[PDB]
Design an enzyme around this catalytic site. Structure first.
Site, PDB file in Angstrom:
ATOM      1  N   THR A 158       0.725  -1.207   0.000  1.00  0.00           N
ATOM      2  CA  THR A 158       0.000   0.000   0.000  1.00  0.00           C
ATOM      3  C   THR A 158       0.787   1.309   0.000  1.00  0.00           C
ATOM      4  O   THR A 158       0.169   2.371  -0.126  1.00  0.00           O
ATOM      5  CB  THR A 158      -0.821   0.027   1.254  1.00  0.00           C
ATOM      6  OG1 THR A 158       0.039  -0.021   2.353  1.00  0.00           O
ATOM      7  CG2 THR A 158      -1.905  -1.072   1.301  1.00  0.00           C
ATOM      8  N   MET A 159       2.067   1.262   0.235  1.00  0.00           N
ATOM      9  CA  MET A 159       2.900   2.505   0.227  1.00  0.00           C
ATOM     10  C   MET A 159       2.525   3.371   1.413  1.00  0.00           C
ATOM     11  O   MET A 159       2.694   4.579   1.419  1.00  0.00           O
ATOM     12  CB  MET A 159       2.725   3.293  -1.070  1.00  0.00           C
ATOM     13  CG  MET A 159       3.077   2.539  -2.239  1.00  0.00           C
ATOM     14  SD  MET A 159       3.208   3.552  -3.802  1.00  0.00           S
ATOM     15  CE  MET A 159       3.407   5.132  -3.275  1.00  0.00           C
ATOM     16  N   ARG A 160       2.045   2.770   2.459  1.00  0.00           N
ATOM     17  CA  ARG A 160       1.699   3.466   3.647  1.00  0.00           C
ATOM     18  C   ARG A 160       2.966   3.633   4.501  1.00  0.00           C
ATOM     19  O   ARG A 160       3.150   4.624   5.163  1.00  0.00           O
ATOM     20  CB  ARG A 160       0.558   2.781   4.441  1.00  0.00           C
ATOM     21  CG  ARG A 160       0.042   3.568   5.636  1.00  0.00           C
ATOM     22  CD  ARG A 160      -0.788   2.740   6.612  1.00  0.00           C
ATOM     23  NE  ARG A 160      -1.419   3.590   7.545  1.00  0.00           N
ATOM     24  CZ  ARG A 160      -1.106   3.669   8.797  1.00  0.00           C
ATOM     25  NH1 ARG A 160      -0.080   3.006   9.259  1.00  0.00           N
ATOM     26  NH2 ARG A 160      -1.764   4.487   9.607  1.00  0.00           N
ATOM     27  N   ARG A 161       3.703   2.517   4.698  1.00  0.00           N
ATOM     28  CA  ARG A 161       4.888   2.475   5.518  1.00  0.00           C
ATOM     29  C   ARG A 161       5.991   1.673   4.834  1.00  0.00           C
ATOM     30  O   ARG A 161       5.653   0.664   4.187  1.00  0.00           O
ATOM     31  CB  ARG A 161       4.522   1.828   6.843  1.00  0.00           C
ATOM     32  CG  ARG A 161       3.568   2.620   7.665  1.00  0.00           C
ATOM     33  CD  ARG A 161       4.114   3.947   8.181  1.00  0.00           C
ATOM     34  NE  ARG A 161       3.260   4.615   9.139  1.00  0.00           N
ATOM     35  CZ  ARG A 161       2.293   5.463   8.844  1.00  0.00           C
ATOM     36  NH1 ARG A 161       2.008   5.827   7.591  1.00  0.00           N
ATOM     37  NH2 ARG A 161       1.583   5.959   9.869  1.00  0.00           N
TER      38      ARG A 161
END
Ligand SMILES: [Fe+2]
Ligand SMILES: [Fe+2]
Ligand SMILES: [Fe+2]
Lengths: 282, 282, 282
Positions: free
Chosen positions: B72-75
């Site tokens: 998700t490219m969140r973290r």
């Protein structure tokens, strides 16, 4: 099956004529041209003329004054990625008193026609929406007028109850709008005497699956039609209120892949908190 | 209208200077460079250097150890379709103690700057969010650092309150980031002395329509710039909490095509259960 | 790390064998082939044959009779933008009694295999879903069979618990399906003796981050394989119920960028009112 896109006279449908044929159109095709619905070509041209003049000759400041601060194409002018002008029942943004007069009248006639045809779709299918017909049809319409400069639009189906489309033709005669009919893409040309109706997914939903929501697209020209290929379209989405309520099991019986707990839901439960006008199958 | 992208000093705005000009920028353009906000180029380069070293020389195992199990490219690290590194206030994934020290400091400075500029946007527009300013600004930020190898990004607007962007330049001098200003796409070059601020749709929402959320895109080079066309960008999204509450009629007055029953709603009611950082008009 | 796509025998996993290796596969790769799960190639071919015959020789009327009025690919036939046939546990649309017999048996075997493998994913990770394992697995599956005529599918991850894929090969031997493994795209060929399992994001969610949801795509051939490049795939999505409930803080710890107020949420709160089967990182 004949794979002709039929024409119905709204006045005739209102008098109870052609009911079997209208039902069969709705179920097997989900699109038709509509005559005798109060939408003339002369009026189309008066609204088209004044907005094309604005698109062409309006200054950046004039355009900015009728541009929303979020570029949603809900209201006012949108310089696009084409040019668009949008309106609804309220909260409109108008360039001049003259434009306002002409576009309010045009919107109202489109809204009246869309309600009327939707009322016939409901009657022909024996459908009484939860909460009654007239509350269902006093709704959240959106009108978008788009100018296209000399696929141009990917295939999708509409999520409206119905969508009314009035086009202007390509000067070169190319027919850009196409829909799936009988498993083949079929031309949907401009007709000065009729509006094109597409049924959308809410028609399918509210009627329990008695109305098809057809896929359609806009094609680009090949070699000869660079020249003469500009066109415009007036697209009127008749969209339900957020609180429109339907049966969850019934939705599942007719192809809706819902993820809804419980037995009833609203349009807002289904689509979310922002209107979504179209959907891709892909 | 001048169609220049203006520069404001955060310190000056905090002292109550340039208020008319800041208001007018916010309404007519929705973007500006920001100096005097605690974000240096030297620090940009220390965080950039350590993450580029990781991108270049980190082994697959090192990379896997800082990759979330959903992409998700969140973290953490994302090998993309480019390479990205993401962080927020907690739940971070860091390659080494040194990286952690440098990136925590960098994040904190970006978060402080974003809050501060948002506080000025609110003050200049007379806006008190439901629940108060400081609860609104103690929020759900996301920082994404992207390396791009030698359009590259489709036009959209951001759904943040504000977005802070620090770039590194193309070695060949090509300017990739562009925004709509005055109806024309305008270059947004790297400046060692300033951060670029885009206003996002939540600014428009919370202020009742007093702030534009501009569209922007990233262009690719033509013939000469294959060579020297890599770049990076540090994109800090200042995003509201799920329970941020606003007026539904007010939202409709300023272009939001909401499908929300009732008079008030939350950010979660509007966008749903997953953050959406950007939106296309198309 | 070996970047081989491993094979597990469902029967062996059910007997408690290879648990460390299964756990490590689930966390580091999130995909594996599955043998000894009741899915033969001979049956694949009997279901494939009868649907390919329908695709090829079914008349437009036959096709219309098994086409939903909204083109969602939930149930029945979809002429696509390829051809597809979809089914679930109920509300199916079948061309003939023979087709119904063969496809009901095939679906049931796919459903049984998917539940069984998901049960092992849960057991190996020590996971008891809220509400218990068996209510979690009595769910909302979707089976889609797609014929592709001579990228073909953009990179994404699945939002299922698990997805079971049975393919037919390209006559020319080209391998079209690819997944990210060890930071490189790796071939996922047809195997007559095994089904391919992808873990989806709900596996990641329900296990608290112990299972990766890998990205994958379908590639097109280059110069030699125009000829012999048709293929089919049987894709079985094991999807949770709308009321599947999970911990919001736990979701945030493993990469989900949720916008959910409060401490617990449902699948419907997260994804909305319509199922979403796949997601792009891009
Ligand atoms: Fe449409
Ligand atoms: Fe952006
Ligand atoms: Fe997939």
């Amino acid at each position: 099956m004949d794979t002709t896109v039929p024409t119905f006279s709204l006045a005739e449908l209102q008098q109870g004529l052609h009911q079997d044929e209208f039902r069969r159109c709705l179920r097997d095709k989900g699109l038709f041209y509509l005559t005798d619905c109060g939408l003339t070509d002369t009026e189309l041209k008066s609204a088209k003329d004044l907005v094309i003049d604005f698109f062409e000759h309006g200054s950046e400041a004039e355009k900015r004054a009728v541009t929303s601060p979020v570029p949603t194409m809900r209201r006012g002018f949108t310089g696009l990625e084409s040019m668009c002008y949008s309106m609804g029942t309220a909260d409109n943004l108008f360039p001049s008193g003259d434009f306002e007069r002409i576009w309010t009248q045009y919107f109202d006639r489109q809204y009246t026609a869309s309600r009327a045809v939707a009322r016939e779709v409901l009657r022909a299918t024996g459908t009484e929406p939860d909460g009654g017909v007239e509350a269902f049809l006093d709704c959240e319409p959106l009108l978008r007028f788009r100018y296209f400069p000399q696929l141009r639009m990917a295939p999708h189906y509409d999520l409206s109850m119905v969508t009314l489309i009035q086009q202007t033709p390509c000067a070169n005669g190319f027919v850009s709008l196409q829909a799936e009919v009988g498993g083949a893409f079929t031309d949907l040309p401009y007709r000065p005497d009729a509006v094109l109706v597409f049924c959308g997914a809410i028609a399918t939903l509210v009627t329990g699956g008695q109305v098809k929501a057809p896929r359609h697209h806009v094609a680009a020209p090949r070699r000869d039609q660079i020249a003469g290929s500009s066109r415009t379209s007036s697209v009127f989405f008749l969209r339900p209120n957020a609180d429109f309520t339907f049966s969850v099991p019934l939705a599942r019986e007719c192809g809706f892949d819902v993820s809804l707990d419980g037995e009833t839901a609203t349009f807002q439960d289904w689509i979310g908190g922002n209107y979504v006008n179209i959907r891709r199958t892909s």
